[PDB]
Design a protein around this motif. Sequence first.
Motif, PDB file in Angstrom:
ATOM      1  N   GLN A  21       0.861  -1.184   0.000  1.00 17.63           N
ATOM      2  CA  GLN A  21       0.000   0.000   0.000  1.00 17.63           C
ATOM      3  C   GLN A  21       0.899   1.238   0.000  1.00 17.63           C
ATOM      4  O   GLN A  21       0.577   2.254  -0.619  1.00 17.63           O
ATOM      5  CB  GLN A  21      -0.919   0.018   1.227  1.00 17.63           C
ATOM      6  N   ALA A  22       2.031   1.143   0.697  1.00 22.36           N
ATOM      7  CA  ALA A  22       2.987   2.249   0.764  1.00 22.36           C
ATOM      8  C   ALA A  22       3.491   2.570  -0.637  1.00 22.36           C
ATOM      9  O   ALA A  22       3.587   3.737  -1.026  1.00 22.36           O
ATOM     10  CB  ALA A  22       4.158   1.878   1.661  1.00 22.36           C
ATOM     11  N   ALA A  23       3.815   1.530  -1.399  1.00 18.87           N
ATOM     12  CA  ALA A  23       4.296   1.728  -2.764  1.00 18.87           C
ATOM     13  C   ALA A  23       3.197   2.369  -3.612  1.00 18.87           C
ATOM     14  O   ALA A  23       3.475   3.190  -4.484  1.00 18.87           O
ATOM     15  CB  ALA A  23       4.730   0.388  -3.377  1.00 18.87           C
ATOM     16  N   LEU A  24       1.947   1.997  -3.349  1.00 17.08           N
ATOM     17  CA  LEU A  24       0.807   2.543  -4.088  1.00 17.08           C
ATOM     18  C   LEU A  24       0.628   4.035  -3.773  1.00 17.08           C
ATOM     19  O   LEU A  24       0.381   4.849  -4.670  1.00 17.08           O
ATOM     20  CB  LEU A  24      -0.468   1.779  -3.714  1.00 17.08           C
ATOM     21  N   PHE A  25       0.744   4.388  -2.495  1.00 17.07           N
ATOM     22  CA  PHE A  25       0.615   5.782  -2.078  1.00 17.07           C
ATOM     23  C   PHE A  25       1.752   6.613  -2.670  1.00 17.07           C
ATOM     24  O   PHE A  25       1.586   7.799  -2.968  1.00 17.07           O
ATOM     25  CB  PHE A  25       0.637   5.882  -0.548  1.00 17.07           C
TER      26      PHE A  25
END
Lengths: 332, 332, 332
Positions: A21-25
Amino acid sequence: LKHFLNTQDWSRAELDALLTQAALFKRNKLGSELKGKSIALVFFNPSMRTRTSFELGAFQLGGHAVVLQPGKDAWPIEFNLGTVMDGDTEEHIAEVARVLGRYVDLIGVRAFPKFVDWSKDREDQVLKSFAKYSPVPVINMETITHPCQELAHALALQEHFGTPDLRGKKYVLTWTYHPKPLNTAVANSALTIATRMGMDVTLLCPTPDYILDERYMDWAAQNVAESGGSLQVSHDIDSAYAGADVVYAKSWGALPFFGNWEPEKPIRDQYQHFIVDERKMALTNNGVFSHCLPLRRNVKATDAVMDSPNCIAIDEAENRLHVQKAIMAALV
Amino acid sequence: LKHFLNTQDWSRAELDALLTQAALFKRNKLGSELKGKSIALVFFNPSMRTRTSFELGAFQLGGHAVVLQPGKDAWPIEFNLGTVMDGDTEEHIAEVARVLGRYVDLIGVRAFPKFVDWSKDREDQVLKSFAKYSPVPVINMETITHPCQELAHALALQEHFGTPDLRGKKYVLTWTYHPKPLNTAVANSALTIATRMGMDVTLLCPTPDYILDERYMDWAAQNVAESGGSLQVSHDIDSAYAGADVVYAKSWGALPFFGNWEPEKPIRDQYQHFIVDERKMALTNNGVFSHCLPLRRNVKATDAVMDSPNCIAIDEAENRLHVQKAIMAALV
Amino acid sequence: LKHFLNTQDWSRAELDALLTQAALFKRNKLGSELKGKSIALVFFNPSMRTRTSFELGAFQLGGHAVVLQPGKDAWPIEFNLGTVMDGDTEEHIAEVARVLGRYVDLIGVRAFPKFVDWSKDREDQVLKSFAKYSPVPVINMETITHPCQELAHALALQEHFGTPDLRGKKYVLTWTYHPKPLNTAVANSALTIATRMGMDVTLLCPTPDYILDERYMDWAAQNVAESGGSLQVSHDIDSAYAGADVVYAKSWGALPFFGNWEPEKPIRDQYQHFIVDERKMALTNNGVFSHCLPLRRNVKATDAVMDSPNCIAIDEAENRLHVQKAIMAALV
């Protein structure tokens, strides 16, 4: 209720989801995951990266962070149970956590050890008390471990090697010099996450007295057994850096000398050569270097190493913003 | 990369555009110029107007300001290059600027001189270091010059006279009393902008020792030659205020006595009569009075002058909000 | 211009409307009543609940709060008129209020008494000066009265008894112990609102020396006559708690010993038995207990009482958020 006190409390699948999710954000930073929501960032100690990244993260997700500093702009808090409060503390954590819980949706807490008695600091009383009395999720912003730093560090490594699978990489967590004894928090966290990721970890430190608390050495042993990596303690600089893929530096006072730092001073002072320089990094397998920051130049690491293209400290710092947004999003 | 360190670095057309956008924002204050964007407001010294106006300006344009105070809530910063950081500073500006650059879109910085050695303070090390290492635009929130104040001041004057063209107006920058020697910043800025605007400027001060640093006297000389105005130094109160259209007061310690204020004390104390009162303002051509604020009443200016309808200090203070929004909008 | 300095300045219909809007906001917390608007929260003393609730309230209504701390991050302010400002203060409230008035739409102010001379503290100089010079509404965030606390307290009581009409309820405002003399503010406010609500009020305190300032005793007398309640002063614990429906505790230094607390210390120390415990609460008509917080456990109230289901202190704390949003909405 689910909190983010330590990565060790989370399953590998949950941590992997957080990192993803961090990579997505990082690709789409503005969102509505925290629209109309808020987080109370309680700081018992100074901060630049953590305060800034959390405050901005809340803003970018449509929420709002309230920054509080007990003993400074807010009232001093008592954590001991069943005690007569006629001293310096004005209110009890039982009330503070419940009150904040009626205002915000999340509570972040930063509280460094007192450095008087490790037996007491290692209990992690402040963080545990917030988690115990709070009706909303609590996030560790650094106490005796620094889990948000762990994930920012992990993400940066996966981005560097271009893969989420870090198994097989040689990881060196090395002690570094500092005119004073510091918190083992970041070191405890580095050892924890590097082993959880299945890397071949070597804990490089001056003497056996600088080995981390048993709690974390055990977490590491259990992590290696589950991840397929390995753990090793070393006091020889050269053999450590040799073929290393990653080198993470951090200074900390020897636990056995906790509270009585007088005799530990002459001990750390004779190991100033643990400073990360070009000579050591040249022994690595074109390895990367990083530090959680703040970093004292020409003490912990040399100007050359810090300005080297192999230093990913700035990237790791940036990732604090992205992984924290993933954490708040997951808990809210 | 374009920064806002001093108006002197900007062309007259660029400054005119800034003042015009400021006037536009004053008519329509809510906008989206900074939607989803942020600014780190780094304060090394106290502030009321600057912190409030910048924070609100970011909010009104859809952005968010993060307020940081190194040495207070954030870590102390080192600016000297190639030095062993084993002192009070925790991290280097090289890292701080790069880290902030991964979080925010703009960085504002306020750092007053140390008052120990002008030779060192005049180098403007803090501001220049931020501009050097930052990957995003840097804004001067007051160091040895106060450019945001210059534009708020300029706008207020144009609004008062009802025209953007101030050529021909008699401008008096007068020194005023204060129980202690202060920063020449605002005076340096007033001299700079008043001449850049082409006014007939007179620098009124007690003795030749109170003449501003050569750097600014030269900027002023060059400005007059290009703007069509004029520059003059005077030590006679009456001849100065005579026929003045504008009177800007500011106190500052004599540069030659920098670091050694002991003997400068008895010198400033014998010129308490430089205080701006009704008698002096009555000698002006129905002139306007202003001060950057904060202002000590009955010391720098009298209650009567401050409460006079000719005092535009409150309007100038308000304009800080509008010109700063124009500056952030232009740099983002 | 309408301000919120004290509930006593507002009509019963206006207060009822505030409490009702507060209940409405509690059901639908996000709104646009302050969209694009801002409030300057000026704190001259520490705060946890007030700063957090106001900051979040502004956010939830689409506005923004700017937190300022004079003497800390902002400049120290002078309030005396016609004085030579050559001391510690940097600027005058006349300028500060006017400047803020050009930036924000509302100003909240918290300023505790100095505790040197009640004759001076009781004049409420800071709050009155802000209200006098500010061009925008001013809100009392606690000085010598705490009106926002009054309404949060009142709402919590109406919610507990399930009705807006509290007439007939036995209300006990009891003094409690504390190793030091405190501000009478909350006590002054409790007496004021409990009588305005028409309850049967008993002011329980150790000796006649602990009776509140005449100003508030008179407000209370006038309130009872209009509300239909009653006022009574008592020094007997048991007869006070008997049949009580509500018990509000607060510690404060005896006014007659203001400035000279030396001899008042041995006086308060012999009344430590005023602490609210199970024994006393057991004498009540299944009464409710509350405190404005922060509260020192086992000093002001026992752990048992604080953890009792009859303690509505957390609910009262939450209501601070709702009533303050009603106040800002009404004034903007």
